[PDB]
Amino acid sequence: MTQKFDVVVIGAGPGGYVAAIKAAQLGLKTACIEKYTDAEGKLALGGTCLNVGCIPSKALLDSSWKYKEAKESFNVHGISTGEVKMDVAAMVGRKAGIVKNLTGGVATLFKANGVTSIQGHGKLLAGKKVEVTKADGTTEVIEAENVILASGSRPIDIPPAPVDQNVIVDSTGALEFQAVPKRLGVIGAGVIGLELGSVWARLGAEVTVLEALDTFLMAADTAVSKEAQKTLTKQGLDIKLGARVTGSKVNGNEVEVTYTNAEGEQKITFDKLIVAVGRRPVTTDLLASDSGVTIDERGYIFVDDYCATSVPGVYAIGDVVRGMMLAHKASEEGIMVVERIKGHKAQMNYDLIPSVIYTHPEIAWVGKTEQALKAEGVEVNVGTFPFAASGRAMAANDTGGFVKVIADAKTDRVLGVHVIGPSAAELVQQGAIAMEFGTSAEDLGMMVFSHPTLSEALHEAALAVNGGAIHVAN
Amino acid sequence: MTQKFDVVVIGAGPGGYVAAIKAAQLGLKTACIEKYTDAEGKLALGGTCLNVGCIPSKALLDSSWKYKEAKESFNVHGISTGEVKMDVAAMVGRKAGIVKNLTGGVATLFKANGVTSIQGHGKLLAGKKVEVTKADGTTEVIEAENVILASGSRPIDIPPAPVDQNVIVDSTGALEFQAVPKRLGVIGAGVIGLELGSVWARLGAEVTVLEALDTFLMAADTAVSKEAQKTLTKQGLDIKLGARVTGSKVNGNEVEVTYTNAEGEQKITFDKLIVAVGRRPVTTDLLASDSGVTIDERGYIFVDDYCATSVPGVYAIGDVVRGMMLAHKASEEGIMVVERIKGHKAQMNYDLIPSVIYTHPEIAWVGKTEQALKAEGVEVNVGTFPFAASGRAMAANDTGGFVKVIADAKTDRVLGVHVIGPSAAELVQQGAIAMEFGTSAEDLGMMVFSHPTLSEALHEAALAVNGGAIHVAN
Ligand SMILES: Cc1cc2nc3c(=O)[nH]c(=O)nc-3n(C[C@H](O)[C@H](O)[C@H](O)COP(=O)(O)OP(=O)(O)OC[C@H]3O[C@@H](n4cnc5c(N)ncnc54)[C@H](O)[C@@H]3O)c2cc1C
Numbered sequence: 001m002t003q004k005f006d007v008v009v010i011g012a013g014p015g016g017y018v019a020a021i022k023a024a025q026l027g028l029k030t031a032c033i034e035k036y037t038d039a040e041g042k043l044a045l046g047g048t049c050l051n052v053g054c055i056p057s058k059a060l061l062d063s064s065w066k067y068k069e070a071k072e073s074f075n076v077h078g079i080s081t082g083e084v085k086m087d088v089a090a091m092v093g094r095k096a097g098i099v100k101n102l103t104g105g106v107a108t109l110f111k112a113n114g115v116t117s118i119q120g121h122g123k124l125l126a127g128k129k130v131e132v133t134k135a136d137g138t139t140e141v142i143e144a145e146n147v148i149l150a151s152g153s154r155p156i157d158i159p160p161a162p163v164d165q166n167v168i169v170d171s172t173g174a175l176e177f178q179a180v181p182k183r184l185g186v187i188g189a190g191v192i193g194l195e196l197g198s199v200w201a202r203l204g205a206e207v208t209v210l211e212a213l214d215t216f217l218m219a220a221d222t223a224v225s226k227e228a229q230k231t232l233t234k235q236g237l238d239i240k241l242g243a244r245v246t247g248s249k250v251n252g253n254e255v256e257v258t259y260t261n262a263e264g265e266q267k268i269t270f271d272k273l274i275v276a277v278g279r280r281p282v283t284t285d286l287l288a289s290d291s292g293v294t295i296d297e298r299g300y301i302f303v304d305d306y307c308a309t310s311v312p313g314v315y316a317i318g319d320v321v322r323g324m325m326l327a328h329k330a331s332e333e334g335i336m337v338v339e340r341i342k343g344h345k346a347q348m349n350y351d352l353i354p355s356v357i358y359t360h361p362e363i364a365w366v367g368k369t370e371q372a373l374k375a376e377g378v379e380v381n382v383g384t385f386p387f388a389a390s391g392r393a394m395a396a397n398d399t400g401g402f403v404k405v406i407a408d409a410k411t412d413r414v415l416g417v418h419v420i421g422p423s424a425a426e427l428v429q430q431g432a433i434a435m436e437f438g439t440s441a442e443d444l445g446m447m448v449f450s451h452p453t454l455s456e457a458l459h460e461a462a463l464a465v466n467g468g469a470i471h472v473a474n
Numbered sequence: 475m476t477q478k479f480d481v482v483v484i485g486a487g488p489g490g491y492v493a494a495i496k497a498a499q500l501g502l503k504t505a506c507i508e509k510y511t512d513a514e515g516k517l518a519l520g521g522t523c524l525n526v527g528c529i530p531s532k533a534l535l536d537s538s539w540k541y542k543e544a545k546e547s548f549n550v551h552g553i554s555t556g557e558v559k560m561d562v563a564a565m566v567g568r569k570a571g572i573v574k575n576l577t578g579g580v581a582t583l584f585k586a587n588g589v590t591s592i593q594g595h596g597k598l599l600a601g602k603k604v605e606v607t608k609a610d611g612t613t614e615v616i617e618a619e620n621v622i623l624a625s626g627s628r629p630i631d632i633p634p635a636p637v638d639q640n641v642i643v644d645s646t647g648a649l650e651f652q653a654v655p656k657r658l659g660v661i662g663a664g665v666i667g668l669e670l671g672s673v674w675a676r677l678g679a680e681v682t683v684l685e686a687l688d689t690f691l692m693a694a695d696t697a698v699s700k701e702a703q704k705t706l707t708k709q710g711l712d713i714k715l716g717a718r719v720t721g722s723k724v725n726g727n728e729v730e731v732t733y734t735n736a737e738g739e740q741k742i743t744f745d746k747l748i749v750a751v752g753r754r755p756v757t758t759d760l761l762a763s764d765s766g767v768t769i770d771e772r773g774y775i776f777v778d779d780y781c782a783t784s785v786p787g788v789y790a791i792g793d794v795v796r797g798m799m800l801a802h803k804a805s806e807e808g809i810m811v812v813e814r815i816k817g818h819k820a821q822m823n824y825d826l827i828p829s830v831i832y833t834h835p836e837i838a839w840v841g842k843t844e845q846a847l848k849a850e851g852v853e854v855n856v857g858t859f860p861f862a863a864s865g866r867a868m869a870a871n872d873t874g875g876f877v878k879v880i881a882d883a884k885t886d887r888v889l890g891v892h893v894i895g896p897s898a899a900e901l902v903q904q905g906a907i908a909m910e911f912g913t914s915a916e917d918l919g920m921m922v923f924s925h926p927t928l929s930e931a932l933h934e935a936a937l938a939v940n941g942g943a944i945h946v947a948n
Pocket residue numbers: 010011012013014015016033034035036046047048049050052053054055057120121122123150151152153171192282284285286317318319320325326327328330356358925926
């Protein structure tokens with residue numbers, strides 16, 4: 001009595017669970033396999049994003065920001081408090097409650113949509129056959145007409161500082177500290193390192209970020225990255241570029257890190273060290289030798305522009321394949337794939353995928369950067385508006401940053417929108433929507449924007465493109 | 475000899491100052507007359523919006539919210555404080571600084587754009603001639619080829635409770651209290667009353683809102699207004715509908731208000747009473763008897779759909795004319811008018827002017843309401859998404875409210891977007907931009923939205939229109 005499904009999804013992350021639900025919505029008998037469990041051995045959907053990634057980081061970022069603001073920015077509004085203290089265990093407990101509630105909601109969506117969730121390790125055998133390994137080493141083989149490989153990724157482990165889930169930890173561990181470490185070191189100045197570094201810095205940690213690369217957020221706009229580094233150094237993140245870690249020595253509750261930069265070989269001791277150099281795609285026991293699915297030199301599963309593998313009916317989405325390792329990317333690929341299975345001539349749009357960094361000020365952008373377009377030989381018009389001139393921002397006592405719009409000098413078509421400041425993610429989305437309809441700098445500048453709102457910064461930025469802004473001289 | 479200008483603008487509010495700057499940008503020798511002065515008799519640009527309206531209210535709203543959150547919502551994040559106290563004088567002092575900074579900036583924009591600002595009372599004589607009355611009763615006449623009347627509005631004064639800038643105050647006075655009134659009464663449950671009522675309620679006042687009308691925000695969507703009333707009553711605003719004020723008696727530092735509702739005649743005593751039933755258009759000494767500009771039964775200056783009066787070359791914009799009394803409305807009318815003067819084929823679109831109520835949760839919308847479209851005989855498709863399911867919102871500890879999208883059942887064209895919750899104004903602007911390009915519910919549902927962000931609620935709402943949402947059952 002072999003079980004049979006129309007679609008089998010291996011993995012329950014932003015790519016996997018969305019796909020499963022979407023397949024069920026289209027009448028496909030879907031099953032979603034997942035090995036990840038909560039702290040009591042029970043199934044936990046939502047992947048990295050929900051369990052040890054996106055949500056958790058945002059929870060601690062919001063709580064840690066409310067503490068920093070209460071200590072320094074409350075006086076200005078006339079608000080006094082006594083001493084302001086943070087109980088880390090309770091901060092982390094609030095986060096756990098949020099995660100537990102959200103994971104339970106995905107399970108609710110699965111039941112309501114009719115998705116059969118299976119708890120175990122899934123492996124793709126030959127002939128779209130899937131082997132599920134139960135907790136007690138028992139094996140069951142299930143039949144699938146379509147398979148969606150969505151195993152995501154894991155953190156990179158570096159030889160000089162191997163993680164030991166105690167003094168040296170990865171992103172997952174850095175979300176579990178039960179006390180603020182006096183001295184915190186972070187390897188990797190990327191999005192993850194900066195968010196995790198910001199949290200503990202706000203709570204009193206002496207944070208040092210050792211980045212081996214000579215650049216800082218090179219993917220972002222030169223102006224946005226120059227501002228982020230300046231603002232983040234003020235917040236207590238001692239960001240050191242061109243610093244390569246060569247070794248570490250754990251001693252009791254301390255670790256002495258050894259690195260090399262332009263000046264020579266230095267040493268620094270931390271109470272806790274977070275390794276966050278990047279993430280590698282996961283395919284551990286995911287494929288049988290004769291499954292027919294090819295892996296690439298860097299660990300990613302080969303797929304075409306539609307996330308289809310060599311094998312008919314076998315697709316691979318999210319972090320385990322090429323592209324930006326973002327949750328919304330994975331999700332959209334999941335939807336694109338399911339529609340393709342149902343026969344739609346679907347293809348998602350990779351050109352307008354925004355990126356968001358949840359530091360404070362928030363950073364986000366969509367489209368091309370100014371420096372990438374100078375190298376591409378495109379003459380552009382640049383308009384910017386600082387939040388220092390936004391009335392809404394002044395009311396909120398959060399005036400740092402700006403909005404930058406980039407248009408083509410000949411057509412006036414908006415080629416990119418970049419923001420660093422309050423509600424940056426929302427302003428960038430407004431830009432993305434406009435660009436989707438192929439907006440010009442003029443088109444946005446002619447629209448009616450609410451007053452007073454943070455959205456106006458995008459409006460003044462668009463007008464400033466062609467030197468027609470009202471709230472900043474041209 | 476006699477001074478000559480291409481454009482003369484009477485009034486320096488959101489309609490007036492924007493128009494002046496915009497006229498200067500297009501090479502028109504512009505002059506802007508303004509009688510309003512700061513507390514030291516010196517010119518103060520920005521009108522009601524900047525001096526005693528928009529900006530000031532937002533400042534106190536943001537500060538008062540930070541106090542409420544610190545008292546009740548901090549323990550959840552693990553943050554403990556001593557006693558939390560608000561120094562009202564400092565709260566109001568921060569606001570004054572913001573206003574002073576912004577008013578100075580408009581003056582800076584005028585100088586930089588080459589606008590001649592004149593400090594005095596302007597009056598439109600016959601033949602596009604403008605009479606300026608200086609502080610010492612001296613009179614000067616200036617010549618104009620075009621005149622833009624932008625005298626705005628003032629608060630309604632009611633006979634049963636005449637304002638005395640002490641116990642009984644209007645919006646302007648309610649922004650100047652130097653102590654939290656123990657018992658605060660508010661006449662009018664409109665946008666202004668709710669924002670002013672919310673501020674002092676959060677600071678410990680016992681607030682009662684007497685609304686004569688049987689409805690509550692009837693201009694908003696039925697769902698948005700039903701939710702706002704529920705949430706605002708929980709926050710301490712005792713909103714009483716069908717309660718008409720018949721008289722008041724001031725006695726020392728108290729006022730006994732007398733009203734009539736369905737139950738009979740009641741009495742209640744307040745320490746401070748804010749009159750906020752609405753606003754009337756201002757035309758005091760604005761027109762000479764033979765200027766040729768017609769006034770309406772309710773005080774508004776007659777204009778066509780392009781803000782042009784009967785007199786050639788005489789335009790009237792903002793609150794002094796028909797339409798929603800909003801700053802961004804006035805501004806856009808100012809721009810529309812200036813472009814028409816320069817000969818451009820300009821024409822406003824009044825259907826896509828969003829409205830924003832800055833209470834917490836924030837309320838905003840653009841386009842038509844569900845109830846207005848049922849009466850209009852338009853078959854619609856409705857999609858909604860609650861913030862209780864937004865991961866970003868849970869992280870922020872602010873889950874109340876929802877996003878509601880309305881599309882035409884045949885074309886799928888988005889006819890309206892309504893929001894009550896976090897970043898409501900920004901999500902609605904995203905909708906406005908989409909509608910400007912004539913979006914369908916499907917168009918938005920197919921875009922890539924960042925995760926996790928509040929913008930996703932607009933995304934799930936758009937998908938839910940045609941029953942394709944992922945995070946809420948269909
Ligand atoms: C601290 C942190 C913060 C982040 N913040 C953001 C953010 O703000 N925004 C953003 O867009 N991205 C963020 N990311 C990245 C985001 O987590 C990933 O892009 C996203 O989770 C990828 O989704 P996925 O479903 O492809 O893989 P995952 O979410 O990793 O899901 C893969 C799942 O597959 C399971 N699995 C793997 N192999 C098997 C098997 N053989 N059998 C059964 N199950 C298997 C795993 O247990 C896992 O649960 C963050 C990451 C981290 C670490």
